[PDB]
């Protein structure tokens, strides 16, 4: 069992800590390490969680930790430091020998910043003079949704008036009471909520960019929502009905001309299933209805996230693709972490050829906070240098707006990051370069 905090070893060691959120793993455990005289770094994917550790440690233990985020760093000179993974990377990683112990919290996290952060720690900690790296999570990879004592789970059949993701919902099952239906998209939420209204039911849609008050506090209601609800709203429900699908970023080696990165419908994993289910069964018995028995277990992520790491290396952290590969290699080689196809050589080769980006476009896409700032600005750079329009006039291609009256002809398409709305040419040298990266890799070709 990995349920107890590791003892500090005499020389270097990587260990796992599996413990629930709030249980002490991010707070009590580093406090106890510091009471022993060690300097402790705690990394977390969230700015909010990171600040919150500081508030807990101060008020509960009279410990004022250092707190480091992209906005600002607060330094007390104390032995414990909380940082986001992003700020840690921006600070140069293990500029040791600063810390004796590094706790990678929520180490199941599969956002690109966490992955690159954790790989950085694993590649650098020992050389930086650390004695211990703790990979801590409340949700170890390979986790599956487990039975809940207060929630009755009932599969959907094909019997029912309301068509729902290949199955049916009987109306009797949502007439009277308060029910929550998860749909994968805002459009499905609008379609279903309209349909239910027409059937005489009290239904209302909820998603990103609507007020929480549009959900009534009392009364029979059927709420039709996306995962936006969970951040979100607080009340619980008589039942949850889950479409068991979600929208996520995926790469497709679509060869038109190269690859496509976009949001795609995919099977839901154990974490999503557990979270959606958990909106019923609070304080009384709940009901969970599902389209499909799950799941993907947790802890698998898409090759597009590896791409995103190389992107971030080049955009934010002044890392060459070769440097990024070293860090990601340490991550992939460490057992017990999230897993993904080994596309390191491929993605490295691609970014290696993306030379002479325009600095001003890159600062614009960075400041704008859109995904893949490096690839978006590189496409924009290619567009401007060819006096050609962007793939579309989506907000993505914002930096080219001032130049719009002088951009014309087909887009020299490098790859696809969203919908295509202009004529394309595939003659650009970089396009050819990226196609060759694909052909030169047996895992991708
Ligand atoms: C991409 N990215 C995320 C973070 C996390 C944070 O906001 O602390 C970050 C920090 C500094 C530089 C870049 C960063
Ligand atoms: Cl904790
Ligand atoms: Na109504």
Tab-separated table of C-alpha atoms and ligand atoms in Angstrom:
chain	number	residue	atom	x	y	z
A	1	UNK	CA	0.000	0.000	0.000
A	2	UNK	CA	1.051	3.558	-0.861
A	3	UNK	CA	-1.289	5.019	1.742
A	4	UNK	CA	1.332	6.370	4.183
A	5	UNK	CA	3.754	9.269	3.640
A	6	UNK	CA	7.216	7.976	2.716
A	7	UNK	CA	10.051	8.269	5.223
A	8	UNK	CA	12.848	10.554	4.028
A	9	UNK	CA	15.654	8.360	2.596
A	10	UNK	CA	19.407	8.895	2.955
A	11	UNK	CA	19.837	9.130	-0.789
A	12	UNK	CA	17.478	9.648	-3.714
A	13	UNK	CA	14.115	7.925	-4.066
A	14	UNK	CA	10.823	8.313	-5.921
A	15	UNK	CA	7.751	7.184	-3.996
A	16	UNK	CA	3.971	7.176	-4.381
A	17	UNK	CA	1.421	8.554	-1.997
A	18	UNK	CA	-2.208	7.596	-2.614
A	19	UNK	CA	-4.468	9.521	-0.242
A	20	UNK	CA	-7.737	11.472	-0.453
A	21	UNK	CA	-8.086	15.153	-1.122
A	22	UNK	CA	-7.970	17.085	2.150
A	23	UNK	CA	-6.476	14.162	4.077
A	24	UNK	CA	-3.147	15.867	4.830
A	25	UNK	CA	-1.032	14.799	1.828
A	26	UNK	CA	-0.562	18.368	0.607
A	27	UNK	CA	-0.376	20.050	4.002
A	28	UNK	CA	0.169	17.923	7.157
A	29	UNK	CA	2.701	15.745	5.339
A	30	UNK	CA	4.919	18.635	4.252
A	31	UNK	CA	4.483	20.216	7.705
A	32	UNK	CA	5.833	17.008	9.301
A	33	UNK	CA	8.763	16.893	6.837
A	34	UNK	CA	9.641	20.501	7.665
A	35	UNK	CA	9.405	19.814	11.420
A	36	UNK	CA	12.221	17.339	10.752
A	37	UNK	CA	14.323	20.105	9.211
A	38	UNK	CA	13.852	19.432	5.488
A	39	UNK	CA	12.935	21.998	2.828
A	40	UNK	CA	9.811	20.968	0.979
A	41	UNK	CA	8.363	21.927	-2.390
A	42	UNK	CA	4.730	21.157	-3.156
A	43	UNK	CA	3.569	21.404	-6.768
A	44	UNK	CA	-0.112	21.558	-7.767
A	45	UNK	CA	-1.959	22.087	-11.070
A	46	UNK	CA	-4.167	24.855	-9.616
A	47	UNK	CA	-3.487	28.492	-8.721
A	48	UNK	CA	-6.500	28.393	-6.384
A	49	UNK	CA	-5.464	25.166	-4.665
A	50	UNK	CA	-1.934	26.551	-4.314
A	51	UNK	CA	-3.063	29.755	-2.633
A	52	UNK	CA	-5.439	27.754	-0.460
A	53	UNK	CA	-2.629	25.608	0.963
A	54	UNK	CA	-1.021	28.816	2.187
A	55	UNK	CA	-4.208	29.928	3.913
A	56	UNK	CA	-4.605	26.509	5.572
A	57	UNK	CA	-0.983	26.210	6.726
A	58	UNK	CA	-0.912	29.729	8.159
A	59	UNK	CA	-4.164	29.558	10.065
A	60	UNK	CA	-3.978	25.944	11.236
A	61	UNK	CA	-0.286	25.550	11.999
A	62	UNK	CA	1.214	29.039	12.166
A	63	UNK	CA	3.338	28.109	9.162
A	64	UNK	CA	3.700	30.837	6.532
A	65	UNK	CA	4.883	29.011	3.411
A	66	UNK	CA	6.318	30.503	0.251
A	67	UNK	CA	3.585	30.693	-2.393
A	68	UNK	CA	4.491	30.892	-6.087
A	69	UNK	CA	2.090	31.386	-9.031
A	70	UNK	CA	2.369	32.975	-12.481
A	71	UNK	CA	0.880	36.213	-11.095
A	72	UNK	CA	3.301	36.611	-8.208
A	73	UNK	CA	5.498	34.885	-5.671
A	74	UNK	CA	5.207	35.409	-1.945
A	75	UNK	CA	8.429	34.636	-0.084
A	76	UNK	CA	8.587	34.182	3.684
A	77	UNK	CA	11.911	32.350	3.860
A	78	UNK	CA	10.129	29.398	5.488
A	79	UNK	CA	11.021	25.776	4.670
A	80	UNK	CA	7.839	24.991	2.747
A	81	UNK	CA	7.074	26.318	-0.713
A	82	UNK	CA	3.803	25.853	-2.635
A	83	UNK	CA	4.014	26.470	-6.386
A	84	UNK	CA	1.920	25.736	-9.440
A	85	UNK	CA	3.516	23.378	-11.966
A	86	UNK	CA	3.526	26.277	-14.442
A	87	UNK	CA	5.312	28.677	-12.136
A	88	UNK	CA	7.815	25.941	-11.238
A	89	UNK	CA	8.613	25.482	-14.943
A	90	UNK	CA	8.832	29.244	-15.533
A	91	UNK	CA	11.264	29.458	-12.594
A	92	UNK	CA	13.618	27.015	-14.340
A	93	UNK	CA	12.572	23.788	-12.625
A	94	UNK	CA	14.885	22.387	-9.956
A	95	UNK	CA	17.327	25.287	-9.628
A	96	UNK	CA	18.644	23.270	-6.681
A	97	UNK	CA	19.844	22.540	-4.209
A	98	UNK	CA	16.791	24.458	-3.083
A	99	UNK	CA	14.576	21.604	-1.848
A	100	UNK	CA	15.132	18.265	-0.076
A	101	UNK	CA	11.677	16.913	-0.821
A	102	UNK	CA	9.435	17.584	-3.786
A	103	UNK	CA	5.833	16.593	-3.633
A	104	UNK	CA	4.106	16.418	-6.978
A	105	UNK	CA	0.473	16.766	-5.902
A	106	UNK	CA	-2.416	15.604	-8.127
A	107	UNK	CA	0.201	13.719	-10.125
A	108	UNK	CA	-2.573	11.970	-12.059
A	109	UNK	CA	-3.283	15.321	-13.751
A	110	UNK	CA	-3.019	15.082	-17.508
A	111	UNK	CA	-2.888	18.737	-18.448
A	112	UNK	CA	0.319	19.526	-20.348
A	113	UNK	CA	1.760	21.814	-17.661
A	114	UNK	CA	1.459	19.123	-14.985
A	115	UNK	CA	3.027	16.462	-17.214
A	116	UNK	CA	5.967	18.599	-18.250
A	117	UNK	CA	6.313	19.816	-14.653
A	118	UNK	CA	6.429	16.298	-13.238
A	119	UNK	CA	8.875	15.109	-15.922
A	120	UNK	CA	11.049	18.088	-15.067
A	121	UNK	CA	11.086	17.122	-11.400
A	122	UNK	CA	11.845	13.502	-12.193
A	123	UNK	CA	14.697	14.347	-14.540
A	124	UNK	CA	16.282	17.039	-12.333
A	125	UNK	CA	15.551	16.295	-8.653
A	126	UNK	CA	18.457	13.956	-7.870
A	127	UNK	CA	21.086	16.045	-9.668
A	128	UNK	CA	19.658	19.083	-7.867
A	129	UNK	CA	20.394	17.377	-4.531
A	130	UNK	CA	16.883	16.338	-3.494
A	131	UNK	CA	16.491	13.185	-1.423
A	132	UNK	CA	12.832	12.402	-2.142
A	133	UNK	CA	10.173	12.906	-4.814
A	134	UNK	CA	6.622	12.059	-3.795
A	135	UNK	CA	4.068	11.419	-6.518
A	136	UNK	CA	0.797	12.136	-4.676
A	137	UNK	CA	-2.749	11.675	-5.891
A	138	UNK	CA	-6.228	10.862	-4.689
A	139	UNK	CA	-6.874	9.230	-8.083
A	140	UNK	CA	-4.156	6.781	-9.124
A	141	UNK	CA	-3.928	5.925	-12.830
A	142	UNK	CA	-5.918	2.852	-13.835
A	143	UNK	CA	-8.629	3.753	-11.297
A	144	UNK	CA	-12.152	2.653	-12.157
A	145	UNK	CA	-15.509	3.881	-10.883
A	146	UNK	CA	-16.480	1.854	-7.831
A	147	UNK	CA	-19.872	1.149	-6.351
A	148	UNK	CA	-21.325	3.782	-4.046
A	149	UNK	CA	-23.370	2.699	-1.034
A	150	UNK	CA	-25.920	5.492	-1.431
A	151	UNK	CA	-26.460	5.393	-5.169
A	152	UNK	CA	-28.642	2.981	-7.106
A	153	UNK	CA	-27.343	2.496	-10.643
A	154	UNK	CA	-29.821	1.614	-13.370
A	155	UNK	CA	-28.884	1.114	-17.018
A	156	UNK	CA	-30.972	2.816	-19.683
A	157	UNK	CA	-32.729	0.484	-22.114
A	158	UNK	CA	-34.186	1.169	-25.530
A	159	UNK	CA	-37.611	1.422	-23.929
A	160	UNK	CA	-38.591	5.068	-23.569
A	161	UNK	CA	-40.193	8.110	-25.192
A	162	UNK	CA	-37.091	10.292	-25.177
A	163	UNK	CA	-34.222	9.275	-27.489
A	164	UNK	CA	-30.919	9.652	-25.618
A	165	UNK	CA	-27.489	8.799	-27.077
A	166	UNK	CA	-28.552	5.452	-28.532
A	167	UNK	CA	-30.851	4.575	-25.666
A	168	UNK	CA	-34.121	5.983	-24.395
A	169	UNK	CA	-35.376	7.821	-21.334
A	170	UNK	CA	-38.848	6.885	-20.087
A	171	UNK	CA	-40.697	10.118	-19.287
A	172	UNK	CA	-42.111	8.645	-16.055
A	173	UNK	CA	-38.546	8.579	-14.767
A	174	UNK	CA	-38.025	12.360	-14.884
A	175	UNK	CA	-41.623	13.552	-14.358
A	176	UNK	CA	-41.799	14.852	-10.802
A	177	UNK	CA	-38.672	15.339	-8.738
A	178	UNK	CA	-35.400	17.076	-9.513
A	179	UNK	CA	-33.211	15.473	-12.157
A	180	UNK	CA	-29.876	16.241	-13.808
A	181	UNK	CA	-29.071	15.109	-17.355
A	182	UNK	CA	-25.480	15.368	-18.606
A	183	UNK	CA	-25.072	16.035	-22.310
A	184	UNK	CA	-21.735	16.382	-24.116
A	185	UNK	CA	-22.534	19.726	-25.794
A	186	UNK	CA	-24.419	22.992	-25.299
A	187	UNK	CA	-26.438	22.233	-28.438
A	188	UNK	CA	-27.574	18.869	-27.069
A	189	UNK	CA	-28.552	20.660	-23.863
A	190	UNK	CA	-30.667	23.149	-25.814
A	191	UNK	CA	-32.189	20.437	-27.994
A	192	UNK	CA	-33.116	18.147	-25.094
A	193	UNK	CA	-34.357	20.962	-22.858
A	194	UNK	CA	-36.610	22.202	-25.667
A	195	UNK	CA	-37.849	18.663	-26.317
A	196	UNK	CA	-38.634	18.121	-22.647
A	197	UNK	CA	-40.399	21.470	-22.375
A	198	UNK	CA	-42.564	20.540	-25.346
A	199	UNK	CA	-43.481	17.321	-23.542
A	200	UNK	CA	-44.827	19.377	-20.639
A	201	UNK	CA	-41.844	18.952	-18.325
A	202	UNK	CA	-40.174	21.759	-16.362
A	203	UNK	CA	-36.732	21.732	-17.980
A	204	UNK	CA	-33.839	24.188	-18.233
A	205	UNK	CA	-30.403	24.031	-19.871
A	206	UNK	CA	-27.163	24.962	-18.114
A	207	UNK	CA	-23.667	25.417	-19.522
A	208	UNK	CA	-20.656	27.767	-19.549
A	209	UNK	CA	-21.947	31.315	-19.819
A	210	UNK	CA	-25.328	31.148	-18.113
A	211	UNK	CA	-26.408	32.195	-14.633
A	212	UNK	CA	-26.753	29.589	-11.902
A	213	UNK	CA	-30.059	31.173	-10.920
A	214	UNK	CA	-31.625	29.800	-14.121
A	215	UNK	CA	-31.758	26.612	-12.042
A	216	UNK	CA	-34.670	26.781	-9.604
A	217	UNK	CA	-33.838	26.108	-5.934
A	218	UNK	CA	-37.139	24.351	-5.334
A	219	UNK	CA	-39.705	22.563	-7.443
A	220	UNK	CA	-39.762	19.747	-9.935
A	221	UNK	CA	-37.115	20.444	-12.530
A	222	UNK	CA	-35.098	18.579	-15.136
A	223	UNK	CA	-31.717	20.260	-15.588
A	224	UNK	CA	-29.914	19.516	-18.866
A	225	UNK	CA	-26.258	20.411	-18.459
A	226	UNK	CA	-22.626	20.050	-19.463
A	227	UNK	CA	-19.770	19.503	-17.026
A	228	UNK	CA	-19.849	23.282	-16.557
A	229	UNK	CA	-22.489	22.560	-13.890
A	230	UNK	CA	-19.931	21.159	-11.508
A	231	UNK	CA	-18.044	24.460	-11.014
A	232	UNK	CA	-20.862	25.669	-11.277
A	233	UNK	CA	-23.760	24.826	-8.955
A	234	UNK	CA	-23.975	23.192	-5.511
A	235	UNK	CA	-27.337	21.453	-5.086
A	236	UNK	CA	-27.886	17.726	-5.550
A	237	UNK	CA	-30.561	15.767	-7.406
A	238	UNK	CA	-33.023	12.850	-7.170
A	239	UNK	CA	-31.298	11.340	-10.199
A	240	UNK	CA	-28.457	11.845	-12.615
A	241	UNK	CA	-28.692	10.602	-16.196
A	242	UNK	CA	-25.287	10.390	-17.866
A	243	UNK	CA	-24.607	10.297	-21.615
A	244	UNK	CA	-21.228	8.768	-20.673
A	245	UNK	CA	-19.401	10.734	-23.352
A	246	UNK	CA	-17.338	13.900	-23.124
A	247	UNK	CA	-15.577	16.368	-25.380
A	248	UNK	CA	-11.777	16.382	-25.257
A	249	UNK	CA	-8.765	17.552	-27.248
A	250	UNK	CA	-7.400	14.851	-29.566
A	251	UNK	CA	-4.834	14.578	-32.341
A	252	UNK	CA	-5.803	12.883	-35.599
A	253	UNK	CA	-3.095	12.006	-38.092
A	254	UNK	CA	-5.549	12.900	-40.815
A	255	UNK	CA	-2.986	13.540	-43.564
A	256	UNK	CA	-4.869	16.607	-44.860
A	257	UNK	CA	-2.011	17.613	-45.153
A	258	UNK	CA	-0.598	16.544	-41.753
A	259	UNK	CA	-2.406	16.291	-38.439
A	260	UNK	CA	-5.511	17.698	-36.792
A	261	UNK	CA	-5.900	18.835	-33.200
A	262	UNK	CA	-9.458	19.535	-32.160
A	263	UNK	CA	-12.139	18.848	-29.566
A	264	UNK	CA	-13.657	15.435	-30.158
A	265	UNK	CA	-16.400	13.324	-28.598
A	266	UNK	CA	-14.827	10.358	-26.725
A	267	UNK	CA	-15.746	7.673	-24.156
A	268	UNK	CA	-15.914	9.104	-20.631
A	269	UNK	CA	-13.348	7.891	-18.090
A	270	UNK	CA	-13.688	6.778	-14.451
A	271	UNK	CA	-13.098	10.258	-13.086
A	272	UNK	CA	-15.792	11.865	-15.196
A	273	UNK	CA	-18.234	9.019	-14.448
A	274	UNK	CA	-17.572	9.296	-10.696
A	275	UNK	CA	-17.954	13.073	-10.698
A	276	UNK	CA	-21.201	13.101	-12.695
A	277	UNK	CA	-22.667	10.289	-10.619
A	278	UNK	CA	-21.736	12.105	-7.447
A	279	UNK	CA	-24.348	14.830	-8.018
A	280	UNK	CA	-27.020	12.507	-6.612
A	281	UNK	CA	-27.095	10.504	-3.373
A	282	UNK	CA	-26.212	13.387	-1.024
A	283	UNK	CA	-28.122	13.089	2.246
A	284	UNK	CA	-30.577	10.556	0.826
A	285	UNK	CA	-30.491	7.679	-1.597
A	286	UNK	CA	-29.642	8.644	-5.191
A	287	UNK	CA	-30.240	7.278	-8.669
A	288	UNK	CA	-27.712	7.129	-11.517
A	289	UNK	CA	-28.793	6.167	-15.051
A	290	UNK	CA	-26.309	5.454	-17.808
A	291	UNK	CA	-26.093	4.827	-21.538
A	292	UNK	CA	-23.137	2.486	-21.252
A	293	UNK	CA	-21.242	0.572	-18.586
A	294	UNK	CA	-18.027	2.425	-18.179
A	295	UNK	CA	-15.320	3.028	-18.584
A	296	UNK	CA	-11.977	4.022	-19.660
A	297	UNK	CA	-10.063	3.726	-16.388
A	298	UNK	CA	-8.459	7.021	-15.368
A	299	UNK	CA	-4.886	7.926	-16.263
A	300	UNK	CA	-4.690	7.729	-20.044
A	301	UNK	CA	-4.093	10.795	-22.142
A	302	UNK	CA	-3.918	11.820	-25.772
A	303	UNK	CA	-0.823	12.353	-27.943
A	304	UNK	CA	-2.070	15.951	-28.500
A	305	UNK	CA	-1.081	16.633	-24.876
A	306	UNK	CA	2.518	15.637	-25.697
A	307	UNK	CA	2.359	18.126	-28.590
A	308	UNK	CA	1.035	20.677	-26.169
A	309	UNK	CA	4.071	20.117	-23.931
A	310	UNK	CA	6.521	20.858	-26.786
A	311	UNK	CA	4.394	23.853	-27.648
A	312	UNK	CA	4.594	25.133	-24.054
A	313	UNK	CA	8.309	24.388	-23.908
A	314	UNK	CA	8.910	26.623	-26.907
A	315	UNK	CA	6.334	29.290	-25.961
A	316	UNK	CA	6.686	29.786	-22.213
A	317	UNK	CA	9.763	28.084	-20.838
A	318	UNK	CA	12.583	28.601	-23.347
A	319	UNK	CA	13.095	24.887	-23.828
A	320	UNK	CA	14.391	23.362	-27.048
A	321	UNK	CA	12.430	20.337	-28.280
A	322	UNK	CA	15.384	18.135	-27.236
A	323	UNK	CA	15.150	19.501	-23.686
A	324	UNK	CA	11.409	18.910	-23.589
A	325	UNK	CA	11.989	15.314	-24.761
A	326	UNK	CA	14.433	14.674	-21.909
A	327	UNK	CA	11.834	15.801	-19.363
A	328	UNK	CA	8.959	13.900	-20.973
A	329	UNK	CA	11.113	10.770	-21.265
A	330	UNK	CA	11.638	10.763	-17.511
A	331	UNK	CA	7.841	10.999	-17.094
A	332	UNK	CA	7.065	8.157	-19.479
A	333	UNK	CA	9.804	5.993	-17.905
A	334	UNK	CA	8.486	6.433	-14.379
A	335	UNK	CA	5.994	3.701	-13.484
A	336	UNK	CA	2.710	4.564	-11.764
A	337	UNK	CA	1.931	7.740	-13.711
A	338	UNK	CA	-0.599	8.551	-16.465
A	339	UNK	CA	0.187	6.846	-19.786
A	340	UNK	CA	0.179	7.808	-23.454
A	341	UNK	CA	1.511	6.631	-26.801
A	342	UNK	CA	5.248	7.261	-27.108
A	343	UNK	CA	5.258	10.050	-29.694
A	344	UNK	CA	8.163	11.965	-28.213
A	345	UNK	CA	10.526	11.562	-31.165
A	346	UNK	CA	7.772	12.536	-33.569
A	347	UNK	CA	6.648	15.689	-31.772
A	348	UNK	CA	10.270	16.688	-31.119
A	349	UNK	CA	11.126	16.369	-34.810
A	350	UNK	CA	8.116	18.543	-35.755
A	351	UNK	CA	8.870	21.429	-33.383
A	352	UNK	CA	12.542	21.273	-34.337
A	353	UNK	CA	11.574	22.460	-37.806
A	354	UNK	CA	9.298	25.282	-36.610
A	355	UNK	CA	12.076	27.872	-36.748
A	356	UNK	CA	11.934	31.679	-36.859
A	357	UNK	CA	8.508	32.169	-35.333
A	358	UNK	CA	7.447	35.808	-35.243
A	359	UNK	CA	8.040	37.002	-31.661
A	360	UNK	CA	5.181	39.517	-31.705
A	361	UNK	CA	2.609	36.967	-32.882
A	362	UNK	CA	3.837	34.582	-30.167
A	363	UNK	CA	3.484	37.196	-27.407
A	364	UNK	CA	0.002	37.918	-28.718
A	365	UNK	CA	-1.184	34.273	-28.665
A	366	UNK	CA	0.491	33.795	-25.270
A	367	UNK	CA	-1.204	36.874	-23.804
A	368	UNK	CA	-4.488	35.771	-25.403
A	369	UNK	CA	-4.317	32.494	-23.478
A	370	UNK	CA	-5.525	30.301	-26.350
A	371	UNK	CA	-4.284	26.688	-26.534
A	372	UNK	CA	-1.161	25.868	-28.559
A	373	UNK	CA	0.174	29.445	-28.604
A	374	UNK	CA	3.304	28.283	-30.400
A	375	UNK	CA	1.540	26.394	-33.230
A	376	UNK	CA	-1.102	29.122	-33.668
A	377	UNK	CA	1.564	31.851	-33.855
A	378	UNK	CA	3.716	29.741	-36.159
A	379	UNK	CA	0.843	29.248	-38.578
A	380	UNK	CA	0.149	32.995	-38.307
A	381	UNK	CA	3.821	33.742	-38.991
A	382	UNK	CA	3.772	31.544	-42.073
A	383	UNK	CA	0.557	33.246	-43.169
A	384	UNK	CA	1.941	36.782	-42.825
A	385	UNK	CA	5.206	35.908	-44.590
A	386	UNK	CA	3.202	34.581	-47.507
A	387	UNK	CA	0.721	37.481	-47.294
A	388	UNK	CA	-1.989	34.799	-47.053
A	389	UNK	CA	-5.191	34.620	-44.913
A	390	UNK	CA	-5.402	32.347	-41.836
A	391	UNK	CA	-7.302	28.994	-42.070
A	392	UNK	CA	-10.352	30.905	-40.779
A	393	UNK	CA	-11.245	34.126	-38.998
A	394	UNK	CA	-11.963	32.389	-35.721
A	395	UNK	CA	-10.676	34.364	-32.677
A	396	UNK	CA	-7.667	32.024	-32.796
A	397	UNK	CA	-6.255	33.970	-35.738
A	398	UNK	CA	-6.719	37.345	-34.008
A	399	UNK	CA	-3.146	38.535	-34.544
A	400	UNK	CA	-3.755	38.650	-38.299
A	401	UNK	CA	-6.740	40.948	-38.089
A	402	UNK	CA	-4.831	44.215	-38.673
A	403	UNK	CA	-3.369	42.702	-41.831
A	404	UNK	CA	-6.691	41.383	-43.171
A	405	UNK	CA	-7.004	43.835	-46.118
A	406	UNK	CA	-3.663	42.653	-47.563
A	407	UNK	CA	-3.934	38.909	-46.971
A	408	UNK	CA	-5.234	36.994	-50.003
A	409	UNK	CA	-5.053	33.701	-51.897
A	410	UNK	CA	-4.958	30.215	-50.355
A	411	UNK	CA	-3.817	29.428	-46.793
A	412	UNK	CA	-0.459	27.658	-46.585
A	413	UNK	CA	-1.852	25.042	-44.181
A	414	UNK	CA	0.712	23.505	-41.815
A	415	UNK	CA	-1.822	21.475	-39.816
A	416	UNK	CA	-5.413	21.893	-38.590
A	417	UNK	CA	-6.331	23.447	-35.227
A	418	UNK	CA	-10.014	24.015	-35.884
A	419	UNK	CA	-12.447	24.436	-38.759
A	420	UNK	CA	-11.091	25.282	-42.200
A	421	UNK	CA	-12.821	28.136	-44.007
A	422	UNK	CA	-10.407	29.145	-46.751
A	423	UNK	CA	-8.795	27.566	-49.826
A	424	UNK	CA	-5.524	25.815	-48.982
A	425	UNK	CA	-2.160	25.246	-50.585
A	426	UNK	CA	0.105	22.402	-49.482
A	427	UNK	CA	3.245	23.703	-51.164
A	428	UNK	CA	4.808	25.399	-48.134
A	429	UNK	CA	8.237	23.996	-47.137
A	430	UNK	CA	7.110	23.546	-43.512
A	431	UNK	CA	4.054	21.593	-44.574
A	432	UNK	CA	6.350	19.277	-46.493
A	433	UNK	CA	8.660	19.176	-43.482
A	434	UNK	CA	5.887	18.071	-41.095
A	435	UNK	CA	4.583	15.433	-43.543
A	436	UNK	CA	8.092	13.994	-43.600
A	437	UNK	CA	8.262	13.948	-39.786
A	438	UNK	CA	5.145	11.764	-39.960
A	439	UNK	CA	6.608	9.408	-42.606
A	440	UNK	CA	9.896	9.147	-40.730
A	441	UNK	CA	8.276	7.796	-37.566
A	442	UNK	CA	7.091	4.163	-37.473
A	443	UNK	CA	4.709	4.883	-34.574
A	444	UNK	CA	2.992	7.654	-36.540
A	445	UNK	CA	3.317	6.386	-40.136
B	1	LIG	C1	1.339	28.130	-18.833
B	1	LIG	N1	1.460	28.463	-17.387
B	1	LIG	C2	0.652	28.013	-16.401
B	1	LIG	C3	1.061	28.540	-15.174
B	1	LIG	C4	0.463	28.295	-13.801
B	1	LIG	C5	0.261	29.573	-13.003
B	1	LIG	O1	-0.494	30.453	-13.465
B	1	LIG	O2	0.848	29.707	-11.905
B	1	LIG	C6	2.234	29.367	-15.509
B	1	LIG	C7	3.055	30.140	-14.704
B	1	LIG	C8	4.103	30.839	-15.301
B	1	LIG	C9	4.296	30.763	-16.682
B	1	LIG	C10	3.454	29.975	-17.472
B	1	LIG	C11	2.410	29.272	-16.881
B	2	LIG	CL1	-4.280	18.093	2.303
B	3	LIG	NA1	-40.666	25.632	-17.944
